[PDB]
Design an enzyme around this catalytic site. Sequence first.
Site, short mmCIF file in Angstrom:
data_model
loop_
_atom_site.label_atom_id
_atom_site.label_comp_id
_atom_site.label_asym_id
_atom_site.label_seq_id
_atom_site.Cartn_x
_atom_site.Cartn_y
_atom_site.Cartn_z
N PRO A 51 44.29 35.25 37.76
CA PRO A 51 43.06 35.99 38.13
C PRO A 51 43.02 37.27 37.24
CG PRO A 51 44.22 35.37 40.11
CD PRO A 51 45.12 34.96 38.96
N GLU A 52 41.82 37.68 36.81
CA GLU A 52 41.63 38.84 35.98
C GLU A 52 41.17 40.01 36.83
OE1 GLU A 52 43.15 37.55 32.35
OE2 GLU A 52 42.66 39.53 33.12
#
Length: 252
Positions: free
Chosen positions: A1-2
């Site tokens: 996930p960013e």
Amino acid sequence: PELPEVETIRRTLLPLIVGKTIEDVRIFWPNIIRHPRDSEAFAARMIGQTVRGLERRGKFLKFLLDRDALISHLRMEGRYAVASALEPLEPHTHVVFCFTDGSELRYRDVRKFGTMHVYAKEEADRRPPLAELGPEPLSPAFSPAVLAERAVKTKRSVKALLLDCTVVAGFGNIYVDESLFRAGILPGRPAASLSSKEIERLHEEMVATIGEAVMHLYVYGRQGNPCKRCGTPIEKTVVAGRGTHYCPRCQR
DNA sequence: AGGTAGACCTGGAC
DNA sequence: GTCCAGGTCTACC
Ligand SMILES: [Zn+2]
């Protein structure tokens, strides 16, 4: 996930765990636990504590308990879910925090690259992994000035620079390639070769790029496809040891 | 002194 | 077999 996804996780997970008290911590892949080194110490110290908040620094989630902070990095595939202790566990669940209400916070990670560090709260910001963390990209502390100072001081590429967590917190590969394309700057350009005007422009695209996503891609993953702005095929190479995408006509 | 390139991890995909 | 991948963690000048 960013970063933007971590921010959404932080916002949506908090109400699902705030006020719950840990009754047990079960670890099925001890390597995820980095501090304390002994996963049994990590489990024993958290029992009895209540979850009081959930913050984010870069891509790190910081769970705030009574006495301790749990600092967690999900890397690429890590995920959290809250569910009933009565139901069978999903695959790749490596750490489970059991609360006294019969619910559980489950951490799943098929790659097992995520990390967890627990420390007395007042110590977390001065220890790994938060200690050398640069400023939030959407804060006034991340400024063109700060970026310029770091750029003119290194022999590394502009991409390697943006990827450095001590320079700016949690700015991922996809956002680095999209920001460099929006700013018109080649990723392999020496950071020290950027002009003031380029720095200012890079800084402005970084903020808009990640700012827009915190609240569609030009180059990331589009190699061999035409550039959305000029039609030239996007190219992919390796810069700073990572997949790097760019428009050769529009980035200089 | 400390800036920096490679290496480590891990398992699903080509 | 071979290939990524974040924030470390070495060695290396
Ligand atoms: Zn183009």
